[PDB]
Amino acid sequence: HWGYGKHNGPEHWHKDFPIAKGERQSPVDIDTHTAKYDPSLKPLSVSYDQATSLRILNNGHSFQVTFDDSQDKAVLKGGPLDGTYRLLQFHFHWGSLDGQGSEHTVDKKKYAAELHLVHWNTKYGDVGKAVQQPDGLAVLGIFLKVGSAKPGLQKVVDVLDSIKTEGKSADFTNFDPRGLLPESLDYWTYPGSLTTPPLAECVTWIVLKEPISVSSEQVLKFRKLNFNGEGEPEELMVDNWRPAQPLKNRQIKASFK
Numbered sequence: 001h002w003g004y005g006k007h008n009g010p011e012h013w014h015k016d017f018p019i020a021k022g023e024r025q026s027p028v029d030i031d032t033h034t035a036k037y038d039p040s041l042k043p044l045s046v047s048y049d050q051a052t053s054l055r056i057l058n059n060g061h062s063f064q065v066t067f068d069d070s071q072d073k074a075v076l077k078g079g080p081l082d083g084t085y086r087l088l089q090f091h092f093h094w095g096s097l098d099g100q101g102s103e104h105t106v107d108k109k110k111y112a113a114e115l116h117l118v119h120w121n122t123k124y125g126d127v128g129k130a131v132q133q134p135d136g137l138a139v140l141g142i143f144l145k146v147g148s149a150k151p152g153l154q155k156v157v158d159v160l161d162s163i164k165t166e167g168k169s170a171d172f173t174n175f176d177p178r179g180l181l182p183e184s185l186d187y188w189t190y191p192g193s194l195t196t197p198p199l200a201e202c203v204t205w206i207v208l209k210e211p212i213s214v215s216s217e218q219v220l221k222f223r224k225l226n227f228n229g230e231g232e233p234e235e236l237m238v239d240n241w242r243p244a245q246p247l248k249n250r251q252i253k254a255s256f257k
C-alpha cells in the first residue's frame with residue numbers, strides 16, 4: 001500500500017484516506033512571524049523519569065522505540081493540554097540529504113530530520129480509542145540539524161544495523177528519552193493530524209523551537225535502514241516525510257515571546 005515513493009507517496013494517500021485533504025492536516029509550515037504569542041499557554045510538563053522503553057522496531061515507514069504505556073510512567077501534561085498523555089513511542093522522519101527530512105518547516109526551512117514523541121490522552125483508555133478523538137493524541141516534535149553529535153541518540157544509532165529491514169525488532173530496554181531533548185521547552189502549538197495514514201485528525205501538536213544537533217555519522221546511520229523486507233529489493237528508508245499541508249482555518253500559537 002502507501003509509502004513514500006513516486007507511485008505510493010503523499011500525493012497518493014488521499015485515495016485510500018480522504019481525510020488527507022481535511023481541515024486540520026499535518027505537518028504545516030510554521031510561519032514564525034504569523035504565530036501569535038499566547039501568554040495563557042502553560043509551560044510544558046515533560047515527566048519522563050520513570051520511562052520504560054521496551055523494543056526498537058523497523059515498521060517499513062520509520063524506526064520506533066516503544067514504551068510501557070500501561071501506567072502513568074512517562075507523561076506529557078501542561079502546555080496547551082488538559083489532562084495526562086502517556087508516552088507510547090518515538091520515531092523519526094529524515095531525508096536523503098541534510099537539507100530535507102523534517103515534516104514541519106519553519107519559515108519554509110527544512111531540517112535534516114524530525115523526532116516525534118507520541119503520547120495519548122489517558123481519559124480515552126487505549127490508543128485505538130484516542131485516535132478517534134479530536135484531543136486523543138499529543139505529539140512532541142523536535143527538529144534535528146546536522147552538526148555536533150547528540151550523545152543521548154547514540155545508543156539508538158548503534159542498534160539500527162540489527163533492524164535493517166521492515167519487520168525486524170530488538171530488545172531496547174533502559175533507554176532514557178530525556179537525552180533527546182533540547183535545553184529549551186519553548187514551543188509552537190496547533191491542532192493537527194497524524195502525518196502517516198490513517199492521517200486521523202486527533203493530534204495536538206507541540207513543536208519545539210530549539211532543534212537538537214546530531215552528527216553526520218548519526219544521520220547517515222538512519223539512511224542505511226530499508227523500507228523493504230529482507231528478500232525484497234533493497235530500497236533505502238530515506239525521505240520518509242510528508243510535506244507541509246495547507247494551514248486552512250488554524251492559528252499557530254507560540255509559548256514564547
Ligand SMILES: CC(=O)OC[C@H]1O[C@@H](S(=O)(=O)NCCCCCOS(N)(=O)=O)[C@H](OC(C)=O)[C@H](OC(C)=O)[C@@H]1OC(C)=O
Pocket residue numbers: 116117118127128129131139193194195196197198200203
Ligand atoms: C497504515 C495504516 O493505515 O495504519 C497503520 C496503523 O496505524 C496505527 S495509528 O492510527 O495509532 N498510527 C500509529 C501512531 C501514529 C503516531 C503519530 O504519528 S506522527 N508521524 O503524526 O507522529 C493504528 O493503530 C491504532 C491504535 O489505531 C492502526 O490500527 C491497528 C488496529 O493497529 C494501523 O494498523 C493497521 C494494520 O491499520
Ligand SMILES: [Zn+2]
Pocket residue numbers: 091092093116195
Ligand atoms: Zn512522525
